[PDB]
Structures are given as structure tokens and as C-alpha cells.
Design a binder for these strands. Structure first.
Ligand SMILES: Nc1nc2c(ncn2[C@@H]2O[C@H](COP(=O)(O)OP(=O)(O)NP(=O)(O)O)[C@@H](O)[C@H]2O)c(=O)[nH]1
Ligand SMILES: [Mg+2]
Ligand SMILES: [Mg+2]
Ligand SMILES: [Mg+2]
Ligand SMILES: [Mg+2]
Ligand SMILES: [Mg+2]
Lengths: 195, 120, 113, 209, 122, 102
RNA sequence: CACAGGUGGUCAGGUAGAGAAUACCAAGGCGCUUGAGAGAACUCGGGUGAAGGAACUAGGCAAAAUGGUGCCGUAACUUC
RNA sequence: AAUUCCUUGUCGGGUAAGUUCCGACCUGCACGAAUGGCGUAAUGAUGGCCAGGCUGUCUCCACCCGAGACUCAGUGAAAUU
RNA sequence: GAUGUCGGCUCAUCACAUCCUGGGGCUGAAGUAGGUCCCAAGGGUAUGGCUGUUCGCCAUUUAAAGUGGUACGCGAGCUGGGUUUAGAACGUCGUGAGACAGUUCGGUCCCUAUCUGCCGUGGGCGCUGGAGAACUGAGGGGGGCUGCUCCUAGUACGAGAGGACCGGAGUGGACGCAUCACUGGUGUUCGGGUUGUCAUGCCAAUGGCACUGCCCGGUAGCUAAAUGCGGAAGAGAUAAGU
RNA sequence: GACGACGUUGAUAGGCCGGGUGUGUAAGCGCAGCGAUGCGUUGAGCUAACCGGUACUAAUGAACCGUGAGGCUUAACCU
């Protein structure tokens, strides 16, 4: 979906259940198939499995559908195993089990303007001057821990999305602080404002 | 279901009803006294009395129209000449019904119907 | 008797008499909710049900290659003026057979009177 | 307050200034005269007995003649009772006019609907006619099944089948009144009321909102 | 009226010629479609070069009815032929660029101004 | 209101930067209105903003619009101001729907 | 059974019709050994029906529809 | 397949949607060459499918015309118990 | 010693282990929308293609297209498609007669209601002199469904997208009641056109028959597809809960 | 069955008059045309169940059933 641009709804990693397939009833009554389960996902997410995992597919445009786990096959009843050899089939086949899969979703920032500055710079307070987002602002280093979004709408027709990024220190290059991993949410912004 | 409906069926279709009334209407005026069942007599007045009223005025058109009913020239001949002057000074009620009990064959309500004076 | 009191007191006394099968212009009042304007409707009348205040007549129009039939109430205030240009010559009260035959093959005649 | 009792004379449309046609029912109401007034001490409930129209002297028998003479009222077609509304009062012999319906703007009409005689299941209870083809034999408008197998072993009360339909008291609620006439004694009510032309109707102010 | 499995003409130049009203929208047990209604149609005859193809399923708006349209003064608006305007499935907007034939005023009441505006009649 | 709503609508549309304002005096060709105004919209959001602006000012003026159509889709939205229909549509919609016929 | 069944041969009018079909009649013979009422549900035999036209149903079952003469014209296939 | 349990085999046509039908593949439980194999014009009160007209088959039944049903008069059963 | 079976149609009723509407608790409940659990049976709870199918898959709606009982409800209510006596054929088995929880084509569904039951409608008597009316109400029955739009409000919430609770007003779907004022249907009792034939002595003009001979309209009545109304608000005591 | 209205001191039903409705220019006469046919008389004739009036006809004087003051005890008043 184009509307979504965050994964806050999947940071609690709920267990999504596709209902048990209806058991075959007597008198040649075929059970109903379980209804499909659709999970709302933003555009641009990366799909990774745990254990020999690969990128199954990349979200491209709105409405694109990706198959992640195919449902189990139905269990054939005794009607399907009658022949001349055996005329009263007592054998029953269990339905093939569903796919138990671990999914990792990686999303990059969709903002148009990205900020990079020292913790002493007013990156967070600049969002307040350009938008109404209310991030945490204070007089101490590393006030913000995760990137936050903001939209600058001065006119109804035209607007752009600007995101503030947590500050980085002299030693952030090699690590030992917050690292350089929060610059991964870049290369998508059209312009990178520097404070 | 007979709401504001008139016209009895008499266990006959439209063709038989029209012919039976036509034959009975000519017979009644020819003799001035006939004996028939109560329902037949009561619906006969809705035939002969309009015919007499038409016969009150004598014209080539009326006689031809009167000939279209009862399909008999002699009946038309007696009308416009005999029953015309007698009923000229009368406004309706040319016929009256006299109940006379029941038949011995089928036990049906029997009644005579005749003209007003009959000149007898 | 009692009904006829409301019948007479509500009918219009300026209704023209038009024969079935004539070409009639009907001026109706159409409302958009703000302004009242007159809409014309030209066609040949095919059926008249003249019964007291409930009198009505059916007129037919061939517009854009499609036949449209519309009824009007002779005593309703929705109509404004009824006029006749050409008087048809048909010996039938109802002109329902015009629906089947095409207009070019259904040219009506004038009464010449 | 109370209502009136009258006779339906027919139905007619009403044309408004904007062209909208309102189909109304014309009800004539004669000036009802109160024959009795009831009290808690005697009957335990408050009501007034009224009459309308006129009845022939020969047809009127002595018992009701004394009933009319006691109240000083002439003969009437019938008698009815209307329940009072805890504060309104009427006196014996007072004539009831129609102009009191100039503010109710909502009336309830009760009357005996048309008699349709012995009606079938399809006509009365709006059942579904079975198929007229595909081998169907002597069963088109029949009701069909009328119960389950021997476990109930009976037919429940209130089961829908053929019977006498109509010719019973029917109430139509929340009927708009269009116009009321005093000098002509006419009441114009929007919509259709139960009963045939000439039948007696009872009109009352609406009880619902 | 207009019900399912009904042959329908077209009042626009989208490209279809004959469609099938095969499902009427509005609620459960919907029996009929009036003069202004949303119905589901399938294309039964269309121009090969038109904007729509054969067998497509989409939404349509009734324009003209055989039975007629009841005016508040006991006046009916009859027609010779049943016609509709084709609409997109997701958004109820006209597909054709023109309307051919007369259109009743009732579409104005139900806020269908696209058909009324570009219709050279009532 | 007559001959004054013509200038009132043009002022309101031009107040929000409408482009290529055209007024069609359809006195008798159309049986629903007296005049028509067609205006262009730069983008999808602009078309909705123009439509909301003209409707909102009309309510304050004293005329309630009879309805609008192009709400979900901003390709073409219409406003019914009684005797006047005002169309505001995108750049593409003014050629697919050629409104020079009336 | 005074039974809506079955039983061979001969005579073969007029009109319209190709005709022993069919419709009305001629000569001739009959009104079919229970009638009289009212016009409830429902059953049977029929007529018509707004809009849709098989959406009914196992199934276009039944109904509905076509139906004649003259002229023009008439496909795949084929043992021509 | 009049022959296939697995089977609604797989693909395509027809339909918005086709366990039926038609066209290709052969994994023929369990076709097969006078207990004849394949094709075949015409024919069929033969089986299956689709299209056009037509319609109360249906949505959804309504009214009407006759014969019973109902009442009166006369005659007057039956199964079952 | 016997049609009696599955499916479909008509008609339903009951239970709640509740599909929707109703009232809530928790939430990994920002909002809309969801997850789970409790109370709640008043009402409602789809149309088609395939197959005989119940069941299913598919297409498209709805708030939902609930789960079960009632001889897997209902054939002295209907259907006879499935299966299936007598015919025939294919595959297989057996030398064969024949057979096959293998397939294919065709193949009689009777009953006038005695009793209980139910739907309506009467007679007798009683209610303590008789009679004519009009009512209170002990009790019983019917109905109780809900979509969409607007204001509140683009407000609360939300960075934006998106988008409220409560309350109020309209407008629809299905169901029921009533009516014929309008639109229609029917209207073999009204008028007219027309074919064949016979009759009225003949022309003209009519009548009989041919499905009302075939048609065109159409009075009243009846009727729906037509138009009016209704589902309540409120009061008392409560379930879960606060 | 039953319910409702009326029975001469009556509009209950039928008939009649007027009106409405429906159909559509009746028959006859003469003219034009050889004829079919059209024209003026003419929106004529006819018109069921619908509306308003009208005793012209049918709802007869009657007779039948249904009674003659309505049980006992006690309680509150009236003599
Ligand atoms: N007067 C003034 N003070 C400012 C301005 N900008 C920042 N400051 C002050 O300097 C402080 C810097 O903190 P802040 O802006 O929150 O830093 P930050 O953008 O959050 N960076 P980080 O997330 O890494 O901590 C502010 O809290 C405020 O007190 C400015 O324009 N004017
Ligand atoms: Mg910061
Ligand atoms: Mg504004
Ligand atoms: Mg919007
Ligand atoms: Mg917004
Ligand atoms: Mg909104």
C-alpha cells in the first residue's frame, strides 16, 4: 500500500494464523477452504527468511501481491482409494502441513529530505519550526534514538516529507556509539540538509 | 369476488346466456305471460324493459336496432305498434314478478312475469 | 356529490380541446430548487384519458432517434400552455400502434376542416 | 384530546402550488353529540359516548330511544366511546365540531377493511406459488407442508393457512391531515384509509411521534 | 424495471453496444434498478477499437427505462429502449466522452452530474 | 442571484489561482443551467482544493450546492450551484472530455 | 352397465379450399335420462398480461413462437 | 471414450462464473482390429452441449371465461372398522 | 407382505456452542478498522455458472449470507434428477448361465379426511325476569430488520495519510398492513375493424358459428409493478459490566 | 350459516331521466366518383357494473316465538 510508510504495526511480531482447513465431512461433503490472510505492507520492504534466507521479492508498486506461504493440500477421503484390489478403503490421508516460516521485513526511509548533524545542532527543533511533529528536544547529546518523520505542508497542492536522524559523534565512524547504521535510511532523500 | 358487479351467470357461458334471454324476451312479449325461475325472471327485466323503452320511439333506425335484439321481425312488428302506445305514458316498471312456489321436478323457485296491464 | 365539489373548484377552465393524433406543444414548469423556467415538449398525442380532474393525455416524441412517451395532467399546475399546430386525421381514440411502425412510415394525415 | 367518527366518501388528489399531487381521502364528519359521560365513581374510568348521523324513527327501537332521550339527543347511526386524556372534560349533550383538528397535523384512522371472503393461502399470507410445470400435479396454490414428522405430532397454533380475510378492524397510524373544513364538514387526510366508500371510520389524534 | 439477465443498450460512446445487467447493487435481495441506480454489467457486444472489450465486468448507471419514471405529480417518463452509461469499477465515473439520447432529470437528484452536464437533452 | 454569481465564482476560483478560466453562456442550448464555467487544475490535490474552496464560499454566500461528483477521483469534479455548473478538471481531462460542444 | 373404448363394406351435395383436411350449411338426425341457485378457497380446460426474457428447472418439460403461394436467393460436407 | 477408481487428469475455446460439451497430450487400473478397428454424406418421436426468435418456466403472480367444489330438491356407494 | 429412499420446491418451528445488529472486559486497543472472552435468540440471515447433488469451487452483492435438532423436519403437500425390478451396451471377472459398494441410455409416485391438531365460520344452552346497545379488561396473538448521505467535524486522535464516541436530520433495500387518488394489467356483460360461411325474400343493414373466430381500445370491480403508513420514542425491573 | 341497509310513514333492488365514461363520425338521405370509396347531416349512434334524482315495478293487512313483577339467608338504611 502506498499509504503506509512505517512498520510500527509489526514491531510486536504477532503470530498470523490462516484458519484450519475444513475437515472432509461424511456423505461426500467437501470441506471449505480457509479464507486468505492478507497483511498490509508498505512499499519498498525487503523480505528475508530466517535460515538460508533470501529476498523472495521487493515491493514495487501499489497493489502488488507476493506469496509467502502456500496452504496445505486437502486430505483425500476413502472415496479416492477404492478399486478392484480394495473395495472397502479404511485408509485416510492427513492434510499436508502448512508452512511454518520466519519473516524479516527491512524497510528504508521514504522521506524526501534527510538531516545529518552533530548532537549539538538543532536537528530535532528544526522539525518543530517547519512542521508540527513534537519530537523530544533537550540540551543533552543523543536526545533522539530512532529516526522520526515530519511533513512540511505550507500549501495544499505541494508538500514534502522531511526526516530528522539521530546525531553522530567523531567516533561514530568505526562504532562504539550508535554506529553508522542509521545512515542506511538515506540515498532515497532527494536532498540532504546539513546543520 | 363480486364487488359492485352485476350480471348473473345462470350456469351458462356468454353465448348461451345471450341466446336464452333473446329467445325468452321474444316469447314473453308474444304472450305477455310466461312462467320461469326467479333468477331468470329477475335478469329478464334487464332485457325486455330496455327493449320496451327503445320501442317507445318509432323510427327506421330504432326498429333496425330493435331487430338486432330478439332476431325476429314479428316481435319487432308487435313492438312500436302495440306495446308502444300502452307504455308511452309509463316511466319504467313495465314488468312485474309473481312468485308461485316451486316445481315438482327439481324444486326450483317458480314465478310468473308479465306486463303491467296486458289489456285483458 | 361531495367529491364533485372539490373536483369543480380545483379544475382549470382554460383547457383546450384537442383531438387524438394531433401535434401538441406542452409548456411545463421545471424547478431546480431556485428558479422556475419553462421547458417545451413537442410531439404527437396518442392517448387521452379525460375523466374529471384526473384527466390525462399521453404524447409521444421521437428525439435523437429514440422514442419517448410522456403523460401530462390536464389540471395539474405543472403545465403552463397547451397549443396545437397540426390536427391529425385518425379514426381511433388510442394511437398505440405508432410505437411499432417507424416514424417515416407513420406519417399521419390532416383532417382538412 | 379525543378524535372524531365519520364516513368515507371517496379519494381524490390535491394539487399544490409547486405542482406536487397529494392523494388524499375525503371523510365527512357530522357534528357528534355526546350521549354519556363516564366517571370514576360510577364506572371507574373516564369516557364519553358519542353518536353521528341520523337514523330513521321506525328503525330505532324503544331501548335506544330512551337512551337518546335521556341525553336530549336525537337518533344516531351508531354509538362509540372515546377515552379522555386526564384533564379534558365534556358535558352530556354537547355537540362536537371538527375545527379542533387544526393543530394535531397527525391523525390515526381505524375502520373495518374490505371483506375479501374466504381467501387462499397465497392471497392471505402471501405464500409462494409452486411451479406450474415440470410434472407438478394438482398442487399450484396449495400451502404445502403444515408441520414436521411424528416428533411434534401436531399442528401448532397460529399456523398460516386459508380462511376469512378482511372485514375486520384495521388501524393505519401517522396519517397526515391536509385540510379541514368546518362549514362543509370535510376532513382531508393524506394517504389511503381502510374500508370501502360509505363505511364508518374512527379518526383519532396520533399517539406516536 | 431493470433486473438481472437483462439486455441493455448504451447511452455513451465508450465502445460497447449491448451489455447485460446481471447484478443490481443497493442492498440485499435487490430486485429492481430504477432510473438512477448502480448496476453490474457484462459486455455482450462492443466495437473492437473501443475503450472496452468483450466479456469485461464493470458498473453502469441506468438512464432510460421502458416502464418509466414517476414524477411527483403522477407523470411518467416512458422510453423506447433501455440504456446505461459505463463506469470504472473502483471509481464511479463515466468512461464514455459523450451521451447519445435524452436523460431524465432524476439523475440530478442522486448527484449524477457527469451524465446530466454532457447530455444534449433534458 | 443572477449575473452576479458569474463574477462571484470567477473571483473565488481566481482567488485560489485557477488557470484558463472560460465562461460559456449557455442560455438556451442546455435545459438545466444558464451559464457554465470550466477551469483547469494543476494537480490532483489542487483540483480538490479548488472544489472545496468554491463550495465553502457558496455556503457563506447563501447558496447550498446541490451536489458534487468528482470527490474520490480528482480528474473531474463538478459543483451544482443551482443555475450554474462549474467544472474544474485536470490538464488531461479537458481534452478527453472536449467541452467546446456546448 | 343404456360404458368418453373396439367393429368390415357401399352411398360421398353447396360455398371457400390443392384436397375424403378445415369453417359454415343442404337432405337427414340430434341437444348426449339429474335439475335449480351463489359465483368462496382449491382442482381441471382455456384467454390476456406492464418490465425483464430461461434468471425456473436434471432438462426450454409444458407452454409460447413459426407455419401458405409466387419470385429472388441458399453454406460446410458429400456416396454428387 | 457408452470403456479412466485416482479425476472436476492437464491446457485452450465457449460463459462474468462451465464436475456438462468441444479441441489437443496419453500416466489404455481395465481400447483394439469380423464376439470387427477408424472415418463417414444422408437418415433418427436417439444421448450430450451452445446460439437466435419466442414466451407466466421464473422474478411474481393478477384478472377473466367455463366445468366441479358450496346450498336446495331426487336417487344414492366404497375402501376401513 | 410392500411404493416411502437422497436431492430440490412450498411451509416452517425450536436450541444457542451468536453470522449481523445490541451491551461490555482485556489488549502487543493513537484513530478507523481488528485479536480474545462474557451477557444477550427480538429481528434478519443472497443471487447465478458447474454437478442429481447435500457439500463444495468460481463471479458478483449485503450487516451477515450462523451452527445444529425436529423419522439426517416436511412425498394421505409437489417433484422423481440420484439410486433403482423387468430392456440394452462398454470395461473386468467366469468355460458358461451371469455378476461387479464400475460406468452409460430408457423406465407407472394411488387415496372422496372417521378421530386428534390447526385455520375460519355457525347453531344450542348457560351467565338466575326478559330484551337492545355500549365498554373496562383475566388472558391470547401480530410486529420489533437495517444500509447510505449530511451536520456535529475534516473535530478528538494522528508527523501526515487516514479518521472518531455520543447526538440530531434525511434518503433507500427487504417484510407487513391498507387503498385504487395517479401509472398500468385484467376486464369472453361496452364500442369498433375484419376473414370464411349461413340466415333474416332480395340490395343496404344485422344476427348465428368458426378458441371471445381473429384483433383494436376500454366502464366498474379486483389487482401490483402503483402510493400511504409501521418497526419506535419512553417507563419499570435486570444479564455481563462499571 | 352469519353481518349490514330497507319494507309504502321507502330511494333497498330493478326500470326511467340527466350527467359522466368508453368506443368512435351509427342507420337513412343526397352529392362526387363507372366502381371500390369519400363527403354534409355528425364527435353522431350505442354505452355493463359508476354519480345525482325519480314509487313506474317488487318490498302485502298480517300471523309465530318471546309474558303477566322475577328464589332463600344475612348485612346497611327507610316505617
Ligand atoms: N536559542 C536557540 N536555541 C537553540 C536553537 N536550536 C537549538 N537550540 C538549543 O540547543 C539545544 C540542542 O538540542 P537539540 O536541538 O534537541 O539537538 P538534536 O536536534 O535533538 N540532536 P540529537 O538528536 O543528536 O540530540 C536545544 O534543545 C535548544 O536548547 C536555536 O535556533 N535557537
Ligand atoms: Mg536531534
Ligand atoms: Mg473556506
Ligand atoms: Mg473528500
Ligand atoms: Mg485530509
Ligand atoms: Mg466523509
Amino acid at each position: 500500500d502506498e499509504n503506509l510508510n512505517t512498520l510500527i504495526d509489526y514491531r510486536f511480531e504477532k503470530s498470523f494464523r490462516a484458519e484450519r482447513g475444513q475437515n472432509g465431512a461424511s456423505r461426500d461433503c467437501t470441506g471449505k477452504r480457509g479464507k486468505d490472510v492478507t497483511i498490509k505492507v508498505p512499499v519498498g520492504t525487503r523480505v528475508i527468511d530466517q535460515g538460508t534466507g533470501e529476498t523472495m521479492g521487493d515491493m514495487t508498486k501499489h497493489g502488488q501481491r507476493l506469496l509467502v506461504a502456500k496452504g496445505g493440500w486437502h486430505g483425500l477421503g476413502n472415496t479416492r482409494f477404492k478399486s478392484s484390489v480394495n473395495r472397502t478403503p479404511r485408509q485416510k490421508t492427513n492434510g499436508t502441513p502448512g508452512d511454518k516460516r520466519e519473516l524479516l521485513l527491512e524497510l528504508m526511509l521514504l522521506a524526501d529530505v534527510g538531516m545529518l548533524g552533530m548532537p549539538n545542532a538543532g536537528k530535532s527543533t528544526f522539525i518543530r519550526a517547519v512542521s508540527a511533529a513534537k519530537p523530544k528536544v533537550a540540551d543533552y547529546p543523543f536526545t533522539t534514538l530512532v529516526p522520526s518523520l515530519g511533513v512540511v505542508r505550507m500549501d495544499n497542492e505541494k508538500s514534502f516529507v522531511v526526516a530528522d536522524i539521530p546525531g553522530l559523534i567523531e567516533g561514530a565512524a568505526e562504532g562504539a556509539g550508535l554506529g553508522i547504521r542509521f545512515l542506511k535510511h538515506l540515498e532515497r532523500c532527494r536532498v540532504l540538509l546539513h546543520l | 369476488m363480486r364487488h359492485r358487479k352485476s350480471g348473473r351467470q345462470l350456469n351458462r357461458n356468454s353465448s348461451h346466456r345471450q341466446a336464452m334471454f333473446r329467445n325468452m324476451a321474444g316469447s314473453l312479449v308474444r304472450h305477455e305471460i310466461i312462467k320461469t325461475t326467479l333468477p331468470k325472471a329477475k335478469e329478464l327485466r334487464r332485457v325486455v324493459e330496455p327493449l320496451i323503452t327503445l320501442a317507445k320511439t318509432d323510427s327506421v333506425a330504432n326498429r333496425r336496432l330493435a331487430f338486432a335484439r330478439t332476431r325476429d321481425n314479428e316481435i319487432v312488428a308487435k313492438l312500436f305498434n302495440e306495446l308502444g302506445p300502452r307504455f308511452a305514458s309509463r316511466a319504467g316498471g313495465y314488468t312485474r314478478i309473481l312468485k308461485c312456489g316451486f316445481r315438482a321436478g327439481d324444486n326450483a323457485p317458480m314465478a310468473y312475469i308479465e306486463l303491467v296491464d296486458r289489456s285483458e | 356529490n361531495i367529491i364533485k365539489q372539490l373536483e369543480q373548484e380545483q379544475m382549470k377552465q382554460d383547457v383546450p380541446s384537442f383531438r387524438p393524433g394531433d401535434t401538441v406543444e406542452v409548456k411545463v414548469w421545471v424547478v431546480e430548487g431556485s428558479k422556475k423556467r419553462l421547458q417545451a415538449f413537442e410531439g404527437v398525442v396518442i392517448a387521452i384519458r379525460n375523466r374529471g380532474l384526473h384527466s390525462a393525455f399521453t404524447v409521444r416524441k421521437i428525439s435523437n432517434g429514440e422514442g419517448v412517451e410522456r403523460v401530462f395532467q390536464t389540471h395539474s399546475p405543472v403545465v403552463d400552455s397547451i397549443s396545437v399546430k397540426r390536427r391529425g386525421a385518425v379514426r381511433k381514440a388510442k394511437l398505440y400502434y405508432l410505437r411499432e411502425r417507424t416514424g417515416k412510415a407513420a406519417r399521419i394525415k390532416e383532417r382538412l376542416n | 384530546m379525543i378524535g372524531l367518527v365519520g364516513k368515507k366518501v371517496g379519494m381524490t388528489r390535491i394539487f399544490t402550488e409547486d405542482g406536487v399531487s397529494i392523494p388524499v381521502t375525503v371523510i365527512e364528519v357530522e357534528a357528534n353529540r355526546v350521549t354519556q359521560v363516564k366517571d370514576l365513581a360510577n364506572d371507574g374510568y373516564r369516557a364519553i359516548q358519542v353518536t353521528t348521523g341520523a337514523k330513521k324513527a321506525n328503525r330505532v327501537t324503544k331501548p335506544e330511544a330512551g337512551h337518546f332521550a335521556k341525553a336530549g339527543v336525537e337518533a344516531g347511526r351508531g354509538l362509540w366511546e372515546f377515552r379522555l386524556a386526564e384533564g379534558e372534560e365534556f358535558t352530556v349533550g354537547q355537540s362536537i365540531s371538527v375545527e379542533l383538528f387544526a393543530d394535531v397535523k397527525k391523525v390515526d384512522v381505524t375502520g373495518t377493511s374490505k371483506g375479501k371472503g374466504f381467501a387462499g393461502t397465497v392471497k392471505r399470507w402471501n405464500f409462494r406459488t409452486q411451479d406450474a410445470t415440470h410434472g407438478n400435479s394438482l398442487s399450484h396454490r396449495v400451502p404445502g407442508s403444515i408441520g414436521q414428522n411424528q416428533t411434534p405430532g401436531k399442528v401448532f397454533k397460529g399456523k398460516k393457512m386459508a380462511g376469512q380475510m378482511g372485514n375486520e378492524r384495521v388501524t393505519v397510524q401517522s396519517l397526515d391531515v391536509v385540510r379541514v373544513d368546518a362549514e362543509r364538514n370535510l376532513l382531508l387526510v393524506k394517504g389511503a384509509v381502510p374500508g370501502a366508500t360509505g363505511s364508518d371510520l374512527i379518526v383519532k389524534p396520533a399517539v406516536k411521534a | 424495471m431493470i433486473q438481472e439477465q437483462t439486455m441493455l443498450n448504451v447511452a455513451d460512446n465508450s465502445g460497447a453496444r449491448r451489455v447485460m445487467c446481471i447484478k443490481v447493487l443497493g442492498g440485499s435481495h435487490r430486485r429492481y434498478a430504477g432510473v438512477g441506480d448502480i448496476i453490474k454489467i457484462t459486455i455482450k457486444e462492443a466495437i473492437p477499437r473501443g475503450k472496452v472489450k468483450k466479456g469485461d465486468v464493470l458498473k453502469a448507471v441506468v438512464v432510460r427505462t421502458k416502464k418509466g419514471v414517476r414524477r411527483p405529480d403522477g407523470s411518467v417518463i416512458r422510453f423506447d429502449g433501455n440504456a446505461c452509461v459505463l463506469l470504472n469499477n473502483n471509481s464511479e465515473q463515466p468512461i464514455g466522452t459523450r451521451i447519445f439520447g435524452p436523460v431524465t432529470r432524476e439523475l440530478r437528484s442522486e448527484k449524477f452530474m457527469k451524465i446530466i452536464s454532457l447530455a444534449p437533452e433534458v | 442571484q443572477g449575473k452576479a454569481l458569474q463574477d462571484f465564482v470567477i473571483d473565488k476560483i481566481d482567488d485560489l489561482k485557477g488557470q484558463d478560466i472560460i465562461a460559456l453562456d449557455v442560455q438556451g442550448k442546455s435545459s438545466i443551467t444558464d451559464c457554465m464555467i470550466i477551469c483547469t487544475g494543476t494537480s490532483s490535490r489542487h483540483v480538490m482544493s479548488i472544489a472545496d474552496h468554491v463550495v465553502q464560499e457558496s455556503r457563506a454566500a447563501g447558496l447550498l450546492p446541490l451536489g458534487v461528483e468528482g470527490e474520490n477521483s480528482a480528474d473531474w469534479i463538478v459543483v451544482d450551484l443551482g443555475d450554474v455548473i462549474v467544472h474544474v478538471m485536470q490538464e488531461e481531462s479537458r481534452r478527453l472530455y472536449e467541452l467546446e460542444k456546448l
